[PDB]
Amino acid sequence: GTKSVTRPTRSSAEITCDLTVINAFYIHWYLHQEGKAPQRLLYYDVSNSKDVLESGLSPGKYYTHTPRRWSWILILRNLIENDSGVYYCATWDRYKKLFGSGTTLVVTDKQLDADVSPKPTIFLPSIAETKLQKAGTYLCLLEKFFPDVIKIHWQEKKSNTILGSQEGNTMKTNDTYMKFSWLTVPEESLDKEHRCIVRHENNKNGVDQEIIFPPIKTDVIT
Amino acid sequence: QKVTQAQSSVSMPVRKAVTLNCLYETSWWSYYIFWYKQLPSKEMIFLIRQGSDEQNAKSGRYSVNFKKAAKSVALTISALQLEDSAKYFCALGDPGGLNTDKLIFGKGTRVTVEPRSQPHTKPSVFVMKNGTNVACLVKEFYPKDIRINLVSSKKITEFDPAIVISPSGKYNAVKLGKYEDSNSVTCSVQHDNKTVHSTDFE
Numbered sequence: 514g515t516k517s518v519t520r521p522t523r524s525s526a527e528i529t530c531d532l533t534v535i536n537a538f539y540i541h542w543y544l545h546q547e548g549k550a551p552q553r554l555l556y557y558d559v560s561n562s563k564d565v566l567e568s569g570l571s572p573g574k575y576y577t578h579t580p581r582r583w584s585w586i587l588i589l590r591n592l593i594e595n596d597s598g599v600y601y602c603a604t605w606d607r608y609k610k611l612f613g614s615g616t617t618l619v620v621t622d623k624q625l626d627a628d629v630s631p632k633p634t635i636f637l638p639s640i641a642e643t644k645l646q647k648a649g650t651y652l653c654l655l656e657k658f659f660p661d662v663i664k665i666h667w668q669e670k671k672s673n674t675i676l677g678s679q680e681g682n683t684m685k686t687n688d689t690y691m692k693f694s695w696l697t698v699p700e701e702s703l704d705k706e707h708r709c710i711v712r713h714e715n716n717k718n719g720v721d722q723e724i725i726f727p728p729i730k731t732d733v734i735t
Numbered sequence: 736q737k738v739t740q741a742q743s744s745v746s747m748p749v750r751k752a753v754t755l756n757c758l759y760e761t762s763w764w765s766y767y768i769f770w771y772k773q774l775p776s777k778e779m780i781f782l783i784r785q786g787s788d789e790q791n792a793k794s795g796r797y798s799v800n801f802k803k804a805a806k807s808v809a810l811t812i813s814a815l816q817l818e819d820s821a822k823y824f825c826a827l828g829d830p831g832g833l834n835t836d837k838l839i840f841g842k843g844t845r846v847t848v849e850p851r852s853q854p855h856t857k858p859s860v861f862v863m864k865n866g867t868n869v870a871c872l873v874k875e876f877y878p879k880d881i882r883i884n885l886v887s888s889k890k891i892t893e894f895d896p897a898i899v900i901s902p903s904g905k906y907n908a909v910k911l912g913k914y915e916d917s918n919s920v921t922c923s924v925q926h927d928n929k930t931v932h933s934t935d936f937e
């Protein structure tokens with residue numbers, strides 16, 4: 514449930530609570546910025562429908578919305594660059610305090626292209642690898658995406674089992690990012706088509722991308 | 736109230752053990768300490784809790800060496816597994832246990848689990864292409880130390896290679912670039928005093 518929310522400065526942002534809570538009384542909101550300690554910003558009083566702000570914070574900046582029963586959204590007003598980071602909703606017991614999946618908030622005024630969705634490039638196994646090792650490696654390259662928050666995994670065409678893939682780190686390319694993932698499939702499965710599934714905020718229609726890797730087809734050298 | 740995690744990073748091999756230190760300052764009489772694991776996907780997972788009036792916490796491969804005098808709550812991760820590689824956070828309850836209470840966190844300590852010591856393994860080397868893009872794939876090598884070279888006389892761009900631990904406990908690597916002369920681009924790898932060419936396999 515690791516999402517990103519990219520917004521310009523001076524706008525409002527909505528951050529959704531990922532926890533499934535039964536009989537919540539207080540919903541706590543935490544901010545984690547890279548290199549800093551996670552800290553609570555406020556909590557929401559479920560019974561009185563009130564926000565309790567940490568000392569120093571301006572009223573109106575944060576607001577906990579309840580769109581429906583036992584469902585919470587943190588609304589931030591007047592965004593600044595320093596509002597960026599990972600936001601978590603939290604509660605006590607299932608006593609231990611438990612956290613949601615967390616949302617990466619990205620505040621930027623950067624003038625980017627209309628399409629900052631990950632752009633795919635497919636690589637098919639080399640003839641030397643399939644011949645010698647009775648396995649083929651498929652590589653999926655994703656480029657020119659923003660923000661850096663992305664998830665790539667692999668599946669067979671008519672199967673929902675997650676395959677054993679590997680991945681490189683996300684790398685910055687000018688104002689954008691790139692990432693690649695690869696899958697080694699045995700000879701016996703080389704005749705099957707494979708899917709590289711990419712989850713990203715800026716994908717077309719907010720639905721994850723399904724990149725099809727065609728099956729290896731036999732070729733006679735005449 | 737303050738929480739300090741002095742170590743920024745720590746490295747230990749698989750099956751071995753690592754200890755993560757934490758020091759705190761609190762005015763509260765009775766309190767609680769918690770240890771969390773933060774995944775690279777940013778998920779915050781509860782591991783273990785230690786009480787002010789309790790003995791030493793133990794929950795599977797996790798244990799807490801508690802010293803209320805010095806105010807020290809070191810976490811030990813025993814019999815290390817590769818998925819133990821994460822960022823570990825120490826949190827102080829304010830005081831903890833009550834529904835309105837906040838946690839005061841430390842800045843966290845990164846743990847990297849190293850593969851075990853093994854016989855040296857020479858890799859196989861392959862090249863995959865898509866137009867201008869050339870990927871060099873380096874399979875099953877040990878040790879980690881390697882120089883991967885894509886042989887081109889017209890390089891557009893080159894990225895840092897990605898080195899990962901393989902399911903057999905060795906290493907795999909991928910080096911990508913963009914080359915004008917992509918159709919003739921070949922790969923050479925320097926590893927364990929040997930030179931492996933992608934053309935060796937062709």
Ligand SMILES: *[C@@H]1O[C@H](CO)[C@@H](O[C@@H]2O[C@H](CO)[C@@H](O)[C@H](O)[C@H]2NC(C)=O)[C@H](O)[C@H]1NC(C)=O
Nearest residue numbers: 632633634635636637724725726727864865866
């Ligand atoms: C090089 O990369 C591109 C992009 O993934 C490949 O083109 C796609 O191929 C599939 C079929 O499997 C089509 O459905 C897509 O429409 C194509 N996308 C685009 C943007 O053209 C291409 O096949 C790859 N070439 C090689 C030699 O592997």
Ligand code: NA
Nearest residue numbers: 579582583584
């Ligand atoms: Na509610």
Ligand code: NA
Nearest residue numbers: 544595596597
């Ligand atoms: Na702030």
